[PDB]
């Protein structure tokens, strides 16, 4: 019950599913054959949330994979933990979008959307108690941000009361992979905030940097990154599939974290995490967790968490410990960071504890809070989008694909205004 | 004088491919906690080796029945020791020092003149080429990813195979130059983790093990792969290891519990078999039939190919035995506590009788009760459970007895009440009732966990064992009279000497301190090794002798009349934890801390 | 069969019965389709739905025309004084048969048979030692 | 099974949106086929049971014999898409007197005769998705003048696509019915 | 719609490796096809050692010449099984070429 | 058939062609061991052609 569907799209959303799914199976010890060989009774009590029952006693995840070009699809199955996916669910095209936002949202996707979209009802109707839809996609991939974003609008059009999860990775300005990174984001953002109830930002620059400063791993690999991507993701519902002192489903975290309908952006954090060298030296302490999960470098985005004021905080504690130890630890930091803590709403920090920690760890906590600091990011991307706009650069493709600059113009107008309005409350005082 | 051993009960399959039937058989090597023991099949005689510090990490035997080699894992600062051992001489030949913690495994070339070792996940997985005749550092080079094992080619020692974590690289070694060659196999649309190696005898093709459970095909001629594996079926935890039959048929045992064979043709299992536990070792005897199989749960099984009917030889305690007990005035059957489960074992012959197991809990101080009632234990959760001897079902549950779990339990002569040990400085008594179970313990105050509890014949008074020492004798009737024999150490097991107010006790310090009911000391034994602490003691029915086992590998039994020893124990590894005497007193049995069970014939001139 | 069961070291009786079981080409051929190719050596045998066709290996086709069957065709080209001169074993070894299967070690094979059955019976137990040798 | 339970407004015995739409239900099949497919007429998932010799294919409400699904709900109602072909349904009823009866409706029968054990009754099916409200209150009194107590069994035969089975318990309009019960027009 | 939909189905059938693929034509597919884009040109298994799997369970005793069932013609001796042809099925559902 | 698929047929339905060959058989000389049931159907015939 309280189940949500897994939807991974675009090139940046695929491997995470190739990795996120692996993690879950390890979380429930689900063997590569889809047959349960776990150790604890609690392991399976709520497996319907992410795993369904099939004939013969095997399990198949309830995820729908898609893309405009089959090559990326032709890779997930060859990877470890691919035998769980159902062969029928795959839907693929023949040409691709080529990092062209207009192609994935105006011409190509419109015809192919139904086939991939169609399977939504067959699944969404399949749920015993739908909780929401979680989307893992990147605004930096033209095929993704074009095809991926539209599905949200159609998806939302049928279940308005539902609450939706989106995990989008915006290419940080520090490192760029496709010269058209600015374009596809700006128009995507305009639609993105149009439907999404929740959202999470992630920058690769912040992603690998934590590896170089904290993890210090010798040779980073995307696979190492994916393990980083889900780890924080894995905590999203960890409290949703097992009991706890104060059960925390997906919705209530939504209720406690979005002060206004329009200002619904957060940053996250995952702990514990350290380099291989000191794997034994430190001592796992809640005070150790609280400082780190309040450590700025622990943030998943390049934006400095100390560069703004925290709208609110949410604590998802993994593992056991005394309840009182939860409350005192949180309050002290707010007092020691009052200048960093807004005064509109006292106790803007949410504390919940999960009784089933990650495998191989005793105490774990993922940080989630709405930080105004996001006002920098929307400035940089737009400035990158704005500055190159004046030269009419690369503009003829979307204009030649049925879309007009007015659609280009409208995006920033709803982009820059949201930038100020988010920062408008920053200078407000009681 | 040492103490005679009449049998050894114990086995560990943690180190892969531990079992191997010696070429021509009659010899087999199975790693104990830290020592190597070789046993004869036709005859029951066996030889012992004890020249090692830490536990074994890998064991393998060179072809043609020459000397053996292996490796182990020590602490990070120190370096693992190499395990070159001869054959037909039973004498240590060479010793080497290198590597940080542990090396994955060893395997010799076709000739007995080359040796190579691959370091653990530490040391960047250092691989070095060693000389069989004498110790030298020929040459070596590192590797970026972790290689979990290496096996040399049946022929043409110049070329070997190593199945690295992310890629299977064929390494080439040339004598002319010290360098080592590396070529990368290409697997487009492949991301599989691999575990085992199997080079075909022809040396052209070979096969390996995978975590998914599918066996790939790769010939040494070129890195390209050829096949997929058993279509439409997987073993649910990959491949533990692989072996090659004379016909080429591949016999595989899924660690999930399965024995399967894939023939060299479109691979459809002709026959299947699943054995309890997780397969760990696959070895072929002479004339190629009835291979030897040992699981990960320390199980040894015998099979017949072409119809896989598992047949059990014998298995052993999972690891780190907890305690021993004997039936009142009875020694035919003895039981013990394991890390998660309990078992019932026969004395005359070591064939298992029956068992009582708990899912994810560890127990302490398993004891038997008079009148067959019953097998009672308090578990990590603190609950107290009792089971019937005939079948593994519980009689009554006493839950939430201790916050940090039970620690002690014994038997009252009338057993109308129970006596236990509390870790949080508590001792709780229970006047059991058949209709319901209730407690009336005073809930006393104590600094440390109670490590033992004793009941005298008249069962009024009682002596309490402690970690902070605090040897507080409880009146057990009024729940008062807190007077404790003094010592500023961490005591251990304590028992009552027969028909005597003298209490033979041991503490943290290396000394068998004597204390009476009037703070009198007969003598300070001074039984202590360099860093060995005696952890178990007892007294015979007649106050003539007492057998003691310290933290040392030795079994140290002394006479109570005077501090003069008679015989001792040898051949033990780990930290022995308890020593009891059977009611017949014909033998004294103690188990190894690592999961080793040994029985010793007590000296005749003590009855 | 006669000198065939001795050829592959199999019982005389089984071979004959084994011959009949493979013989029923009709039963597997009476049904529709199921074309076959039975070669087992020099010549190949093929079958479509019902038609028949076959070819003969040239190399074997060549030697029958090797101008050397003249001594084969007549019955009395040999000296005829050797019939009791030669033991059937002498020509037996040189025949194309008895060499199809390699000669394994006769007394060595007797060896492993004395052992594998040795461990099975005496491995029922592995505890009793009566030989301590703790130090070595 | 539905005993000592609160039954006031509705009891969705068979419903077409769930992980295991028929868990309590038991099925026996001889020559037809059982499968669920999205309906063209209405964008929803509905169960379908297709076969021939309708007397052979069917699905039973209670899992197995020796238990009764007794229900104090007075009304019965049930939804189907007409396939312009054979269809049948029958239910079991317990009377005030300690006797067990059953009332059958037939798509392919023209004559009905009140008779002590069974009273077969013809049916007429309307084109397109149709909802039929079974009284189950007047019929019991009309058959033998013996009131209703509880429904003992519910059976559905083959060659009919069913979207939901529930007990209305009272004449309710479409407006009264909740969104789940109400069948929104395509 | 119509075309371009199965193209998403060929790979799906091609999806399973199983040491095989479905190129949409494997055997008995019409007479033949053009050898290249234009018309063709004028001038263009592993088996085991069967003698190895040996004596898994059956003992190695042999009966030998010493035999004879004459005189022991009791009613309990087994009777040789006669032959029975297999059920014919024809090829109603087989491929047609 | 391929002269190799067929033998997968004869050894399949034992009642169709029941006999001594549906099981592995002992060997005359004590040295050799009985082969796998299907195998004896391969050793016997291969020689016959020779
Ligand atoms: N963690 C991780 N990120 C990746 C990987 N491959 C690509 N990305 C991210 O995806 C972004 C590019 O997305 P793109 O392929 O253009 O999306 P698409 O055009 O919709 O398919 C880059 O900024 C990368 O940071 C990977 O293997 N691991």
Nearest residue (by CA) to ligand 1, atom 17, is A141
From the list B144, B100, B94, B95, the residue with the least C-alpha distance to B119 is B100
From the list B415, B325, B314, B331, the residue with the least C-alpha distance to B364 is B325
Nearest residue (by CA) to ligand 1, atom 26, is A222
Any E CB within 8 A of C101 CB: yes
CB pairs under 8 A between E and F: 49
CB A30 within 8 A of CB A57: no
Locate the DSSP E strands across D39-168. Answer: 45-50, 58-60, 76-81, 88-95, 100-106, 118-122, 129-134, 148-157, 160-162, 164-166
From the list A420, A368, A63, the residue with the least C-alpha distance to A201 is A368
Chains A and F touch, contact meaning at least 3 pairs of CB atoms under 8 angstroms apart: no
A135 CB-near residues (< 8 Å, 6+ apart): A7, A8, A9, A13, A148, A151, A152, A164, A165, A166, A167, A168
Cα distance from C113 to chain B (closest Cα, Å)? 8
- Rounded-to-integer distance, Cα A369 and Cα A350, Å: 9
Instruction: Name residue, tokens 């009338």.
Output: B414
Locate the DSSP E strands across A9-105. Answer: 51-53, 59-61, 63-67, 91-92
Chains D and A touch, contact meaning at least 3 pairs of CB atoms under 8 angstroms apart: yes
Neighboring chain B residues of C128 at a CB cutoff of 8 Å: 6-7, 44
Neighbours of B550 (CB within 10 A): 24
Residue D128: strand, helix, or coil: coil
Q: Residue length, chain E?
A: 97
C-alpha A368 chain-centroid distance? 11
Any B CB within 8 A of C129 CB: yes
- Largest Cα separation within chain F, whole Å, is 36
Whether A143 lines ligand 1, by a CB cut-off of 6 Å, is: yes
- Check CB contact under 8 Å for D17 and A125: yes
Neighboring chain A residues of D34 at a CB cutoff of 8 Å: none
Chains F and E touch, contact meaning at least 3 pairs of CB atoms under 8 angstroms apart: yes
A285, A296, B25, B101, B475 from A282: Cα distances, Å: 9, 20, 50, 20, 46
Interface test with E, best of B247, B250, B267 (most E CBs within 10 A): B247
Sketch out chain A's domains with CATH numbers: 3-256 (3.40.50.1440), 265-374 (3.30.1330.20)
Please, which residues 33-92 of chain E have a Cβ atom closer than 8 Å to chain C? 51, 62-63, 83, 85-86, 88-91
Neighbours of A217 (CB within 10 A): 13
- Rounded-to-integer distance, Cα A288 and Cα A275, Å: 16
Cα torsion F27, F33, F37, F43: sign:
negative
- Check CB contact under 8 Å for B302 and C128: no
F6 CB-near residues (< 8 Å, 6+ apart): C28, C36, C38
* Structure tokens, B444: 């006393």
Instruction: Name residue, tokens 């016997």.
Output: F44
- Check CB contact under 8 Å for B245 and E19: no
- Rounded-to-integer distance, Cα D77 and Cα D80, Å: 10
- Rounded-to-integer distance, Cα A411 and Cα A386, Å: 11
From the list D43, D4, D15, the residue with the least C-alpha distance to D163 is D15
Whether A14 lines ligand 1, by a CB cut-off of 6 Å, is: no
- Rounded-to-integer distance, Cα B152 and Cα B109, Å: 5
CB pairs under 8 A between B and C: 85
Whether A138 lines ligand 1, by a CB cut-off of 6 Å, is: yes
Gap from CA of A12 to ligand 1 centroid (Å): 4
- Rounded-to-integer distance, Cα B343 and Cα B341, Å: 7
Q: Supply the DSSP string of B275-332, one letter for each residue.
A: -SS-EEEEE--TTS-S-EEEETTSEEEE--TTS---EEEEE--SSS--EEE--TT--S
Cα torsion C96, C98, C101, C104: sign:
negative
How, if at all, do strands A130-138 and A165-169 pair? Answer: parallel
To the question of whether residue A360 is assigned a binding role by annotation, the answer is: no
Whether A10 lines ligand 1, by a CB cut-off of 6 Å, is: yes
Of B189, B193, B238, the CB nearest to A78: B189
Nearest residue (by CA) to ligand 1, atom 24, is A12
Cα distance from C80 to chain F (closest Cα, Å)? 27
- Check CB contact under 8 Å for B288 and E48: no
Locate the DSSP E strands across B211-284. Answer: 217-219, 242-244, 250-252, 259-262, 272-273, 279-283
* Structure tokens, A96: 């691709």
- Rounded-to-integer distance, Cα F21 and Cα E95, Å: 34
Any A CB within 8 A of D43 CB: yes
* Structure tokens, D6: 């609160």
To the question of whether residue A143 is assigned a binding role by annotation, the answer is: yes
* Structure tokens, B457: 């014949």
From the list B260, B218, B220, the residue with the least C-alpha distance to B240 is B260
Whether A144 lines ligand 1, by a CB cut-off of 6 Å, is: yes
Neighbours of F49 (CB within 10 A): 11
Neighbours of B515 (CB within 10 A): 20
Which DSSP letter does residue A26 get? H
CB B566 within 8 A of CB B532: no
Where on the phi/psi map is residue B189: left (φ > 0), alpha (ψ -120 to 50), or beta?
A: left
Q: Supply the DSSP string of A365-394, one letter for each residue.
A: EEEEE-BGGGHHHHHHHHHHHHHHHTTTTT
- Rounded-to-integer distance, Cα B472 and Cα B449, Å: 12
- Rounded-to-integer distance, Cα B170 and Cα B219, Å: 10
Cα torsion through C126, C128, C133, C135, rounded to 10: 60
- Check CB contact under 8 Å for A90 and E7: no
Residue B135: strand, helix, or coil: coil
From the list B265, E29, F4, E30, the residue with the least C-alpha distance to C36 is F4
According to the entry, how was the structure determined?
cryo-EM
- Rounded-to-integer distance, Cα A14 and Cα A8, Å: 6
Neighboring chain A residues of E12 at a CB cutoff of 8 Å: 87, 90
Where on the phi/psi map is residue F18: left (φ > 0), alpha (ψ -120 to 50), or beta?
A: beta
Q: Is B534 exposed, middle or buried (0-12, 13-18, 19+ CB in 10 A)?
A: buried
Chains D and E touch, contact meaning at least 3 pairs of CB atoms under 8 angstroms apart: no
Q: Residue length, chain B?
A: 607
Neighboring chain C residues of F29 at a CB cutoff of 8 Å: 9
- Rounded-to-integer distance, Cα B358 and Cα A172, Å: 53
Ligand 1 atom nearest residue A146's Cα: 20
Question: Which resolution, in Å, applies to this structure?
Answer: 4.1
**Is the omega angle on the peptide bond into residue A313 within 30 degrees of 0, that is, cis?**
no
Locate the DSSP E strands across B391-531. Answer: 394-398, 406-409, 418-422, 429-430, 450-453, 462-466, 471-474, 483-485, 494-496, 503-505, 514-515
After which residues does chain E break, using C–N > 2.5 Å?
44
- Check CB contact under 8 Å for A31 and B237: yes
CB pairs under 8 A between A and D: 14
HSE toward the beta carbon, residue B298, CA cutoff 13 A: 16
Whether A328 lines ligand 1, by a CB cut-off of 6 Å, is: no
- Check CB contact under 8 Å for B25 and C119: yes
To the question of whether residue A275 is assigned a binding role by annotation, the answer is: no
| A141, A145, A174, A180, best to mutate for ligand 1 pocket (most atoms within 8 Å of CB) | A141
Taking CB atoms within 8 Å and a gap of at least 24, the contacts of F8-16 are F8/F38, F9/C28, F10/C21, F10/C22, F10/F41, F11/F37, F11/F38, F11/F41, F13/E86, F15/E81, F15/E84, F16/E84, F16/E85, F16/E86
Helix intervals (H) in A157-221: 181-195, 204-210
From the list B260, B198, B193, the residue with the least C-alpha distance to A32 is B193
Neighbours of B61 (CB within 10 A): 24
- Rounded-to-integer distance, Cα B190 and Cα B198, Å: 19
- Rounded-to-integer distance, Cα F45 and Cα F39, Å: 10
Residue C119: strand, helix, or coil: helix
- Rounded-to-integer distance, Cα D3 and Cα B23, Å: 72
CB D50 within 8 A of CB D32: yes
* Structure tokens, B304: 């017949």
Q: Is A10 exposed, middle or buried (0-12, 13-18, 19+ CB in 10 A)?
A: buried
Beta bridge partners of B219: B205
Of B265, B288, B289, the CB nearest to E48: B265
At residue A295, what are phi and psi to the nearest 5 degrees?
-70, 135
Whether A140 lines ligand 1, by a CB cut-off of 6 Å, is: yes
B382 CB-near residues (< 8 Å, 6+ apart): B399, B400, B401, B402, B403, B404, B405, B406
Residue D60: strand, helix, or coil: strand
Gap from CA of A11 to ligand 1 centroid (Å): 5
Nearest residue (by CA) to ligand 1, atom 2, is A222
Neighbours of A182 (CB within 10 A): 24
A69, A142, B102, D32 from A9: Cα distances, Å: 11, 12, 43, 40
- Rounded-to-integer distance, Cα A198 and Cα A268, Å: 13
A118, B60, B169, B175, B206 from B159: Cα distances, Å: 55, 19, 11, 11, 13
Nearest residue (by CA) to ligand 1, atom 10, is A12
The H helix count followed by the E strand count for chain D is 1, 13
Cα distance from A54 to chain E (closest Cα, Å)? 20
The H-or-E segment that residue B365 falls in is none
Gap from CA of A226 to ligand 1 centroid (Å): 11
Q: Supply the DSSP string of A69-96, one letter for each residue.
A: SHHHHHHHTTSSS-TTS-GGG-EE-SS-
Please, which residues 51-110 of chain D have a Cβ atom closer than 8 Å to chain A? none
């Amino acid at each position: 019950m309280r189940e949500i569907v897994h939807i991974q799209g675009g090139q940046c959303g695929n491997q995470i599913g190739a990795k996120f799914w692996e993690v879950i199976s390890d979380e429930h010890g689900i063997d590569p054959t889809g047959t349960y060989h776990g150790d604890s009774d609690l392991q399976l009590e709520r497996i319907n949330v992410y795993y369904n029952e099939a004939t013969g006693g095997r399990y198949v995840p309830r995820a729908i994979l898609m893309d405009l070009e089959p090559g990326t699809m032709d890779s997930v199955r060859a990877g470890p933990f691919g035998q769980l996916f159902r062969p029928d669910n795959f839907v693929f095209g023949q040409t691709g979008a080529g990092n062209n936002w207009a192609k994935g949202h105006y011409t190509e996707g419109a015809e192919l959307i139904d086939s991939v979209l169609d399977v939504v009802r067959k699944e969404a109707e399949g749920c015993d108690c739908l909780q929401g839809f979680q989307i893992t996609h990147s605004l930096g991939g033209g095929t993704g941000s074009g095809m991926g974003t539209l599905l949200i609008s159609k998806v939302r059009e049928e279940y308005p009361d539902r609450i939706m999860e989106t995990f989008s990775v915006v290419p940080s300005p520090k490192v760029s992979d496709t010269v058209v990174e600015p374009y596809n984001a700006t128009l995507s953002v305009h639609q993105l905030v149009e439907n999404a109830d929740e959202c999470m930002v992630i920058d690769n620059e912040a992603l690998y940097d934590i590896c170089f400063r904290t993890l210090k791993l010798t040779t980073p690999t995307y696979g190492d990154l994916n393990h980083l991507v889900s780890a924080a993701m894995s905590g999203v519902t960890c409290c949703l599939r097992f009991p706890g002192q104060l059960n925390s489903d997906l919705r209530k975290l939504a209720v406690n974290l979005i002060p206004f309908p329009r200002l619904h952006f957060f940053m996250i954090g995952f702990a514990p995490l350290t380099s291989r060298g000191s794997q034994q030296y430190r001592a796992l302490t809640v005070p150790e967790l609280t400082q780190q999960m309040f450590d700025a470098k622990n943030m998943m985005c390049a934006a400095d968490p100390r560069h703004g004021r925290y709208l609110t905080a949410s604590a998802l504690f993994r593992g056991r410990m005394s309840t009182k130890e939860v409350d005192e630890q949180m309050l002290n930091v707010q007092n020691k960071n009052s200048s960093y803590f807004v005064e509109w709403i006292p106790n803007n920090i949410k504390s919940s504890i999960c009784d089933i920690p990650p495998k191989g760890l005793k105490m774990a906590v993922t940080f989630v809070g709405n930080s105004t600091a996001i006002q920098e990011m929307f400035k940089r991307v737009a400035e990158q989008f704005t500055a190159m706009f004046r030269r009419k650069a690369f503009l003829h493709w979307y204009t030649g694909e049925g879309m007009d600059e007015m659609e280009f113009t409208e995006a920033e107008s709803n982009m820059n205004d949201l930038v100020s309005e988010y920062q408008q409350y920053q200078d407000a005082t009681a | 004088k040492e103490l005679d051993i009449q049998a050894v009960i114990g086995f560990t399959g943690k180190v892969n491919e531990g079992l191997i039937l010696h070429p021509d058989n009659e010899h087999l090597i199975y790693p104990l906690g830290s020592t190597i023991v070789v046993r004869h099949i036709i005859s029951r005689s066996q030889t012992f080796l004890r020249g090692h510090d830490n536990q074994i990490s890998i064991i393998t035997v060179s072809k043609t029945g020459k000397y053996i080699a292996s490796g182990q894992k020590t602490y990070m600062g120190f370096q693992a020791d190499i395990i070159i051992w001869d054959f037909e001489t039973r004498s240590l030949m060479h010793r080497l020092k290198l590597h940080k913690v542990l090396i994955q495994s060893l395997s010799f070339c076709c000739n007995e003149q080359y040796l190579a070792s691959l370091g653990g996940q530490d040391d960047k997985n250092m691989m070095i080429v060693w000389d069989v005749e004498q110790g030298k550092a020929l040459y070596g080079a590192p590797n970026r990813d972790v290689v979990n094992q290496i096996k040399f080619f049946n022929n043409s020692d110049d070329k070997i195979i190593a199945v690295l974590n992310n890629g299977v690289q064929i390494l080439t070694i040339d004598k002319a130059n010290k360098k080592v060659k590396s070529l990368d196999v290409n697997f487009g649309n492949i991301k599989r983790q691999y575990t085992c190696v199997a080079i075909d005898p022809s040396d052209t093709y070979c096969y390996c093990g995978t975590k998914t459970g599918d066996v790939f095909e790769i010939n040494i001629e070129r890195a390209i792969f050829k096949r997929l594996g058993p279509v439409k079926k997987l073993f649910s935890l990959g491949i533990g290891t692989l072996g090659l039959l004379p016909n080429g048929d591949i016999i595989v045992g899924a660690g999930d519990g399965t024995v399967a064979k894939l023939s060299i043709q479109n691979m459809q299992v002709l026959s299947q078999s699943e054995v309890l536990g997780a397969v760990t070792s696959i070895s072929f005897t002479g004339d190629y039939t009835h291979f030897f199989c040992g699981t990960s749960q320390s199980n040894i099984y015998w099979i017949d190919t072409e119809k896989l009917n598992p047949e059990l030889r014998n298995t052993c305690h999972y690891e780190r035995i907890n305690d021993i007990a004997f039936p009142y005035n009875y020694s035919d059957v003895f039981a013990t506590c394991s890390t998660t489960d309990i078992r019932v074992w026969n004395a005359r012959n070591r064939q298992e009788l029956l068992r009582i197991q708990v899912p994810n809990l560890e127990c302490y101080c398993v004891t038997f009760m008079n009148d067959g009632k019953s097998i009672i234990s308090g578990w990590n959760d603190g609950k107290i459970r009792a089971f019937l001897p005939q079948s593994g079902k519980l009689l009554y549950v006493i839950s939430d007895a201790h916050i940090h779990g039970v620690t002690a339990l014994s038997t009252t002569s009338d057993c109308q009440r129970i006596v236990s040990g509390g870790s949080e400085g508590e001792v709780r008594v229970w006047v059991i009732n058949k209709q319901t179970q209730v407690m009336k313990a005073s809930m006393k105050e104590h600094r440390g966990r109670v490590w033992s509890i004793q009941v005298k014949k008249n069962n009024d008074q009682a002596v309490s064992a402690s970690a902070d020492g605090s040897c507080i004798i409880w009146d057990l009737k009024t729940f008062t009279r807190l007077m404790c024999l003094f010592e500023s150490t961490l005591f251990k097991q304590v028992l009552y000497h027969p028909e005597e107010s003298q209490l033979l006790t041991t503490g943290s310090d290396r000394k068998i301190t004597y204390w009476e009911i009037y703070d009198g000391q007969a003598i300070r034994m001074l039984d202590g090794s360099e860093e060995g602490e005696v952890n178990a003691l007892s007294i015979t029915k007649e106050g003539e002798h007492f057998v003691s086992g310290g933290e040392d590998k030795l079994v140290k039994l002394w006479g109570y009349d005077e501090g003069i020893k008679y015989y001792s124990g040898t051949g033990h590894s780990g930290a022995i934890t308890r020593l009891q005497i059977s009611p017949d007193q014909r033998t004294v049995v103690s188990v190894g801390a690592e999961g080793a069970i040994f029985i010793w014939k007590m000296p005749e001139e003590v009855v | 069969a006669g000198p065939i069961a001795a050829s592959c070291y199999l019982g005389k009786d089984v071979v004959s019965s084994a011959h009949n079981a493979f013989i029923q080409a009709v039963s597997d051929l009476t049904t529709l389709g199921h074309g076959l190719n039975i070669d087992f050596g020099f010549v190949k045998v093929y079958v479509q739905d019902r038609d028949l066709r076959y070819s003969y290996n040239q190399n074997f086709a060549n030697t029958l025309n090797n101008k050397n069957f003249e001594y084969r065709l007549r019955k009395s080209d040999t000296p005829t004084s050797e019939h009791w001169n030669t033991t059937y074993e002498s020509k037996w070894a040189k025949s194309s048969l008895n060499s199809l299967l390699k000669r394994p070690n006769s007394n060595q094979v007797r060896n492993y048979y004395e052992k594998t059955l040795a461990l099975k019976i005496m491995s029922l137990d592995l505890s009793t030692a009566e030989q301590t040798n703790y130090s070595r | 099974m539905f005993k000592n339970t609160f039954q006031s407004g509705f009891l969705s015995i068979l419903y077409s949106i769930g992980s295991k739409p028929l868990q309590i239900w038991d099925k026996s099949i001889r020559n037809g086929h059982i499968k669920r497919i999205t309906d063209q007429d209405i964008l929803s998932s509905v169960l379908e049971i297709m076969g021939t010799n309708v007397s052979t294919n069917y699905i039973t409400a209670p899992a197995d014999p020796k238990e009764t699904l007794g229900i104090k709900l007075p009304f019965l109602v049930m939804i189907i898409k007409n396939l312009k072909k054979y269809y049948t349904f029958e239910v079991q009823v317990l009377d005030d007197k300690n006797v067990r009866r059953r009332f059958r409706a037939s798509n392919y029968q023209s004559t009905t005769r009140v008779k002590p054990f069974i009273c077969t009754m013809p049916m007429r099916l309307d084109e397109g998705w149709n909802q039929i409200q079974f009284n189950l209150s007047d019929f019991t009194r009309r058959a033998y003048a013996t009131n209703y107590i509880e429904t003992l069994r519910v059976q559905i035969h083959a060659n009919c696509r069913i979207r939901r089975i529930y007990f209305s318990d009272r004449l309710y309009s479409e407006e009264e019915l909740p969104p789940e019960f109400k069948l929104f027009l395509p | 719609p119509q075309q371009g939909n199965t193209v998403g189905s060929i790979s799906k059938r091609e999806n399973v490796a199983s040491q095989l693929i479905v190129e949409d034509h494997l055997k008995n597919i019409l007479a033949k096809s053009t050898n290249s884009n234009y018309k063709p040109w004028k001038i263009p298994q592993h088996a085991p050692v069967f003698e190895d799997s040996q004596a898994a369970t059956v003992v190695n005793k042999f009966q030998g010449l010493r035999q004879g069932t004459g005189g022991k013609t009791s009613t309990q001796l087994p009777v040789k099984q006669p032959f029975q042809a297999p059920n014919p099925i024809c090829g109603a559902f087989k491929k047609r070429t | 058939m391929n002269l190799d698929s067929i033998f997968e047929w004869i050894l399949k339905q034992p009642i169709n062609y029941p006999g001594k060959h549906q099981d592995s058989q002992p060997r005359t000389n004590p040295a050799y061991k009985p082969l796998e049931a299907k195998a004896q159907f391969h050793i016997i015939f291969k020689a016959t052609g020779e």
